[PDB]
Amino acid sequence: LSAAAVWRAGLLAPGEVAVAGGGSGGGSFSWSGWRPPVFGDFLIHASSFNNAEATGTPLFQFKQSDPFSGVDAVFTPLSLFILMNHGRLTRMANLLYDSPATLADLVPDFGRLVADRRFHNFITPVGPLVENIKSTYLNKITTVVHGPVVSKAIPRSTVKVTVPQEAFVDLDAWLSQPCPADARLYVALTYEEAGPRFTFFQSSRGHCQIMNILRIYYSPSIMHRYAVVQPLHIEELTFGAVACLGTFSATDGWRRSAFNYRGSSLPVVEIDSFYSNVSDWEVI
């Protein structure tokens, strides 16, 4: 047809190509673009891991203060939340892990780092996990650190990103039409007198304007602070910090699925076609 006749230009090769001449200009045939992401490979303790958790889970590396350690473990916000509950949703949190001892003593100081309230600049997000071998010792994982999520192997499978629904708060559902094209996903630290918390935020707005609306949402959590405490040894005036995890497509919305352990059921928000981009920590 004429569609198959006009197919020769629109077949492949992003950009174009000067087909002949005194010189050949441009070669992009047999490569359909779609820039592959770089892979941040980590080697964690298998005692710091759970094999039963799904692949597309946003991770958080705590960087080791120790020089004599080639290895470094990871934190997920489930593991992080049960670590806050051990340092002091819980019934979900105990269902996963047995011993929080090696995770709490894995970081050298955990009550001190919340005492100085500098927990945000020691936790570097490495985005969603994709690649995962299974070993009893020194297990090696790999996460798409920046760019689009994809498996390692030549089957280049899309990996849906599992963020827990109970730890996730919507922005626009609580705010109740600027740009429905961009859909960005933010994680936010949150301090409290009981125990700190990690939460997640879906937003369809831009990155820079999102913090001022987050303060408006977040204000009843800050009205409870400073009535019962007053900071000495001066720290603690910061109350949480936010960063960008990346963007995803708002054309296909998040579809809730069931990440189940054998103990009970646990609903999860699935993010498909996520474009990971870890930015810097922005305090409130």
Binding site: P14, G15, E16, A18, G23, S24, G25, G26
Partner: protein
């Protein structure tokens, strides 16, 4: 308009447009010519630059 104790030496600069005449003898320079190569400096979707 009384003279001070000292004397001064002004120094100016003066750029002048001048046509020169350039001579060179025959075969004073050897030269290697390279063949040209066309490369894409930036792939803009509105207009790619060569």
């Amino acid at each position: 308009k009384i003279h001070p104790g000292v004397a001064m030496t002004v120094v100016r600069t003066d750029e002048i447009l001048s046509e020169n005449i350039l001579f060179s003898s025959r075969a004073s320079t050897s030269m290697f010519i390279g063949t040209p190569n066309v490369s894409r400096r930036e792939a803009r979707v509105d207009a790619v630059t060569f």
